[PDB]
From Swiss-Prot, chain B:
The lineage of its organism: Eukaryota, Metazoa, Chordata, Craniata, Vertebrata. Homodimer. Keywords: Amino-acid biosynthesis, Aminotransferase, Cytoplasm, Pyridoxal phosphate, Transferase. It comes from Sus scrofa. This is Aspartate aminotransferase, cytoplasmic. It is found in: Cytoplasm. One of its GO terms (cellular component) is cytosol.
Length: 412, 414
């Protein structure tokens, strides 16, 4: 002994698995390597893609010397908030016409989820009620648990969702978990392109889900991270949110522009709030301002400026919808091709889930022991859950992946 | 029959944050003599925002570089930004940098850096999940300091004496007494330079006395550094206190903002610098910071951090930036000197050396609330009830009117 560090007992936090997987993919010398663990759009040449419309808008911003760097309002750039909420709800939304919608610019979809969770933990179902159950899908994006736990919720639960046998939605289990949820429980719902499985309810299934939630006063907290990106069409991909609005729900929707604009690193999100009346929006927003203030003070400008300009200009909007469909069509192509080649190899089991699923992520139905084969033997990198990113498939590796998967079903 | 009440029906309306209505009232005022001394950011002599020339230049270079992509940054942020930011605060020759016992977390402005640090301390400092460690802020401080530490879960927020109303300066004896009486391990939120809102800073000799009590009572320094370079034009002088604490062997946090010294307010550029006793703890601390960031904003934005990293890493841009910072610092120094000279030429009662002894864009003038009300209502000069002014609200054109009006308030009111 000779003063002790105030950090002497701080533990090393747990190694998250996906980041070491992409690291292990990079260490691999094998020239057959394929990374199906990526979590962002990639071209047929395995490259990131800045959207043409984004490049165009970035040039217009750079050429506009009148733009300053003064703080945005706490709740964000007004034109961005309006355009983002209109994108989710539709231009002609009655909720917008009736002035009962609010929008809070946020730091990606994550920031929107966090602001909403903080609000609910303080002002929903009582004051400072940390006991309201929060239900997330089984499985879901793992940061869902972390966000709601950090907001103080003590009772995080899951609803049945992925059926490992049918390779699809366990609707009966989901409905039963809704029926058994205490009234006023919060449900975190993927608006489309469920992450990580890719399996979405059909509109008819959504109507059954909404019916139970309406009867039991369950709160819909939608996450919309893939609007337009998922199917190629922004209107189709927002239908479930808009259906809940038309059924009279009050709800939150955490929107991300990370994927559909490719603006991952500019942290562009929006929390849309739908209430019964305009006065409630004013009071809710006043509390969300306090929450934002003590978290990031006010939000950054560059990404929200890009989105606002694109969505406000019909010519740019049309160009953007084309760029979005290009991404969705490449994914739809990889799904169609993978299924066709797996069926051409006569691979055991059914494979229609590969094309029934929606978005960039797919639960393939492979088991962990089959996963380790693809990694160790064939250098195809994917998660133990069997999740793949379809953007890791290309015209050049599709045959290798499909044959390796066929070997990974018949031999292992 | 009756529609159910909204699930939001009992949510109260929050009450506004004071200065926003003041600015709104200024904007609606028809009088051509009106002056906004309540502004919270740098303004030119023509009352305008100023994008720094070096920032415009780097933005053009970024826009012309098609190789840059938009893929997620690491959770902790852009590596070159974090290294450059911590080196700016600590100095290239810092013993802590040489010994590899420094971490840096890119954050959403200085506010985000304060919040990440507060969340970490509320989980891992002075025990596990100890929400009872006292957190001390200056009397007065930026009110969002209290809100950040309260939201991180600290239940015992206290203040240390700081502004002396009678002397128009630092209450050193009160500050030292509050340090001496603070429970061991209490956290002190310290303004590294250009105290906000008063402009009153300890001298180096006073900082040595403050540090001596903190060392002896094991009090944790959580510095804010929002005005480095902006305050004096001299980056080393403006970081002297942080560097002195490092030299004295403290572990500390430093929440840095680039909102003011780069004028990058709306790009939300900050960095939390961590100084630890031993290099091996930095990896452990940063691993916990990663978890905190992940559930807050996931990962930080690129644009502003790229601008700062490019400027600080290139000799030619760095030199241009230091000149741009000096331009801002010198304008504020000029407004302070000119205001003091006019108040003394008018033989205004009281002492006015605090107008030039204070540092940075904010000044506690010493005017009382009734005098402030006179300035707003009678003279259309807008400032806060505390008597805080922003020196950037003064201009060559308005200085005579502002000084004359202050002289009127002092002699006629109260």
């Amino acid at each position: 002994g000779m003063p002790p560090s105030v950090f002497a007992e701080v533990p090393q936090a747990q190694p998250v698995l996906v980041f070491k997987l992409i690291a292990d993919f990079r260490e691999d010398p094998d020239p057959r390597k394929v990374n199906l663990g990526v979590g962002a759009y990639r071209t047929d040449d395995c490259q990131p893609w800045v959207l043409p419309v984004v490049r165009k808008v970035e040039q217009r911003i750079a050429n506009n010397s009148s733009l300053n760097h003064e703080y945005l309002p706490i709740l964000g750039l007004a034109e961005f908030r309006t355009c983002a909420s209109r994108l989710a709800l539709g231009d002609d939304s009655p909720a917008l016409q009736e002035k009962r919608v609010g929008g809070v610019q946020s730091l990606g979809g994550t920031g929107a989820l966090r602001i909403g969770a903080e609000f609910l933990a303080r002002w929903y179902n009582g004051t400072n009620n940390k006991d309201t159950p929060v239900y997330v899908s089984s499985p879901t994006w793992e940061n869902h648990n972390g966000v709601f736990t950090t907001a103080g919720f003590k009772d995080i639960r899951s609803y049945r969702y992925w059926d490992t046998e049918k390779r699809g939605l366990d609707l009966q289990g989901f409905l039963s978990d809704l029926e058994n949820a205490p009234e006023f429980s919060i449900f975190v719902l993927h608006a489309c392109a469920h992450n990580p499985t890719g399996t979405d309810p059909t509109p008819e299934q959504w109507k059954q889900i909404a019916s139970v939630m309406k009867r039991r006063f369950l709160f819909p907290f939608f996450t919309s991270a893939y609007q337009g990106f998922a199917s190629g069409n922004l209107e189709k991909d927002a239908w479930a949110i808009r259906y809940f609005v038309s059924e009279g729900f009050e709800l939150f929707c955490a929107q991300s522009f990370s994927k559909n604009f490719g603006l991952y690193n500019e942290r562009v999100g929006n929390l849309t709030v739908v209430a019964k009346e305009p006065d409630s929006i004013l009071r809710v927003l006043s509390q969300m301002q306090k929450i934002v203030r003590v978290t990031w003070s006010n939000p950054p400008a560059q990404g929200a400026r890009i989105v606002a300009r694109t969505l406000s200009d019909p010519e740019l909007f049309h160009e953007w919808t084309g760029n979005v469909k290009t991404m969705a069509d490449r994914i739809l192509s990889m799904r169609s091709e993978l299924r066709a080649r797996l069926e051409a190899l006569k691979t055991p089991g059914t494979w229609n889930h590969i094309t029934d699923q929606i978005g960039m992520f797919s639960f393939t139905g492979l088991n962990p022991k089959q996963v380790e084969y693809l990694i160790n033997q064939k250098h195809i990198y994917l998660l133990p859950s069997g999740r793949i990113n379809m953007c890791g498939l290309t015209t050049k590796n599709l045959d290798y992946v499909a044959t390796s998967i066929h070997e990974a079903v018949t031999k292992i």
